[PDB]
Each structure stands twice: as structure tokens, then as C-alpha cells.
Amino acid sequence: XXXXXXXXXXXXXXXXXXXXXXXXXXXXXXXXXXXXXXVEAMQAESCYQLARSFHVQEDYDQAFQYYYQATQFASSSFVLPFFGLGQMYIYRGDKENASQCFEKVLKAYPNNYETMKILGSLYAASEDQEK
């Protein structure tokens, strides 16, 4: 109602479309937000939504690349990217970097049930008594 012109607004629209099941609108909004000023290497939401579209489709290589790009883009929302990206390590067969990303996510937000469950499963599968 206010104005759909904006990189952050485009990212929010893409996220709301990807949550509502609409990958074309998400891709278009991501491209428009990456093309527009204010969002070239300062917005994790575009590459984050691209990596989530690839993750939901089981495209973990491009999803991991877009997750790393989003994590390099915006640290202040890094609980969102690395929680995906370490899960891409779960796709890769690398529990160490996955546990590192999940530990960073847990240090950012210690109230996440899903990240806590994933870290518990990873520690029970591959961790010693000191962990």
C-alpha cells in the first residue's frame, strides 16, 4: 500500500512469495533487488531466498553458494543464512563446518528449537564427551 519500490521491499516480497509458494516472483524480486541500488553486497535476503529455493528443491550446491554469498553480504541476519548453509554441509557430508555454522547460529540466537535439535543430533553423531 505504501510503495513496492525498494530493494528491502523487493526482498521482503520475494521472501513472502517464497513462503507462499511462488518461486518466479521470488527470482524476479531477487534480480530486481540485486540490480537496484542499496542491494549489491549489503542484502543477504536475495541470495538467501535463492539458496532457500534451491534447498527446497534439493539443489544444495547452488544453495550453498548463495548461502555463502548471503552470509558474506549481511552479517546482521547471519542466523538465517548459516542455519541453511551448515545444513548444506549436511548435504555435503561435512558435519564439522555444519556444526560450526549451527554453533554460530546458536550463539546468535540461543532459543532456536530447530538449530538446537540439529546441533544435538550432530553432537550425538560425531562429537566427543568434551562437546
Among residues 80, 99, 91, which one has the least CA distance to residue 18?
Answer: 80
Do the Cβ atoms of 91 and 60 come closer than 8 Å?
A: yes
Q: Residue 8 and residue 40: Cα distance in Å, rounded?
A: 11
Q: Could you identify the residue written with the cell 519500490?
A: 5
CA dihedral 68, 55, 113, 20 (to 10 degrees): 120
Documented resolution in Å = 3.1
Q: Residue 88 and residue 100: Cα distance in Å, rounded?
A: 12
Method for structure elucidation: cryo-EM
Among residues 62, 94, 61, 77, which one has the least CA distance to residue 12?
Answer: 77
Considering just the CA atoms, what is the radius of gyration of the chain in Å?
A: 16
The three-class DSSP label of residue 128 is: coil
Q: Residue 89 and residue 87: Cα distance in Å, rounded?
A: 5
Residue type, 39: V
